[PDB]
């Protein structure tokens, strides 16, 4: 089965609405899709418990019907960084649990999107951050890049430190997180030339919740 | 004579109030100090040509007396990645030229400052990157970190990619872009444990414009 991990390059690139596109995308090629977000901050008190609306929007885009706790089996109120909140809550983020969930995934999906959180360097623990797991599971990465002021910078030092990690950058996707502006163009060609993985895509600005919208028609999954 | 390259892990990190407080530090010290800031865009019209505020702030805060076109050789009027205002001018950067000008002021200060435009990748051309230049000077880099959301994940990519360069991580420095906030602690923790360099002080949040504060006081030059 195909197996991706999703991070962003900067905060607010919209990591969410391309995993949506592209969950979107290889459900129309045929897949039996599965979102899967280990590790969300951020979340609304529900009389379930815990619900985080990115990991929501995965289990609602992926094409097999999910229980939220597969999706997402780390929910933490605060939005801060994992390794934070999980130590003063006294609840130890384990690489165990992350690769079961993913794990019991794949034995339903044939297209699994792993989605991070934070940036490729967040920590988990003192010990162990997000981009030990991914090099352990040996997850092909797509990047999602923010079309923003300092996005050249923040793309380049992404991908070279996956791939210096021995893992393979399977595509990017641009995203448009602002309304139409000068030196689009430029930026698209500079990045497009840059980062050594194909462009899957742009989404373009939208003014609602892109990650309610149908976009997965700006996705080629034939690149990837 | 001692010199350093400074760059930021993210635009409005207040990379140009770091380097005005390491000049006064180097100032108090004894040192004859020099700002140079190689590559400016984003700059006003004068009667004697385009003047970039951040150069301005630089040859304001050196200890001894230099022209604009000494801090600043290259100044563009628009605000944009370098490369592209560069090809759409018709005015290649010069690597040559950039070093003739960090040369010209070793030869009257015993420190230099050497602040960079945009981030650690910002492309001087097609095939030329600041990195590439910072890496034939040999010049030892400081960190320029905002203590803000996603500050972790910028400043471990950066230095990897750094040190991964074969160059010298000498410090770096904490600037509050924002007033306190909670887990403002928690953060510094994480990024002094991470951060393979010493922390060499902290910049408070000041509300005005911190490039005309006095915050030498700040800086502990001995820990570099």
């Given at each position: 089965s195909?197996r991706?991990?999703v ?12 995993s ?7 459900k129309?090629?045929?897949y ?5 977000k280990?590790?969300?901050?951020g979340?609304?008190?529900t ?7 990115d990991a929501?929007?995965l289990q609602?885009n ?6 939220y706790?597969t ?18 809550e ?13 794990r019991a ?5 044939d297209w699994?999107l792993?989605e991070?959180?934070?940036?490729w360097?967040?920590?988990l623990?003192?010990?162990?951050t ?12 797509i ?26 950058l399977?595509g ?14 430029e ?9 050594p ?15 309610n919208?149908?976009?997965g028609?700006?996705?080629?999954l034939?690149?990837?």
């Open positions: 195909k991706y991990f991070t962003g390059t900067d905060t607010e690139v919209g990591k969410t609405v391309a949506c596109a592209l969950l979107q995308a290889a129309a090629a045929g039996r899709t599965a979102g899967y280990p590790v969300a901050s979340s609304e008190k009389p379930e418990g815990l619900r985080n609306s929501l929007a609602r992926s094409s097999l019907q999910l229980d706790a999706v997402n089996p780390y929910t933490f109120a605060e939005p801060t960084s994992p390794h934070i909140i999980s130590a003063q006294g609840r130890p983020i384990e690489s165990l649990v992350m690769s079961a969930g993913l995934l794949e034995q339903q999906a699994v792993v991070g959180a934070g940036g360097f967040t920590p623990s003192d010990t162990f997000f981009a030990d797991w991914v090099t352990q599971e040996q997850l092909p990465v990047l999602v890049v923010g079309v923003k002021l300092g996005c050249i910078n923040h793309a380049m030092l992404t991908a070279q430190v996956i791939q210096h990690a021995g893992l393979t399977a990017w996707v641009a995203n448009d997180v602002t309304p139409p502006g000068k030196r689009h163009a930026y698209m060609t500079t990045l497009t030339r840059m980062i993985a194909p462009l899957l895509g742009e989404i373009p600005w939208l003014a609602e919740n892109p990650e919208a149908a976009t028609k700006y996705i080629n034939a690149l990837l």
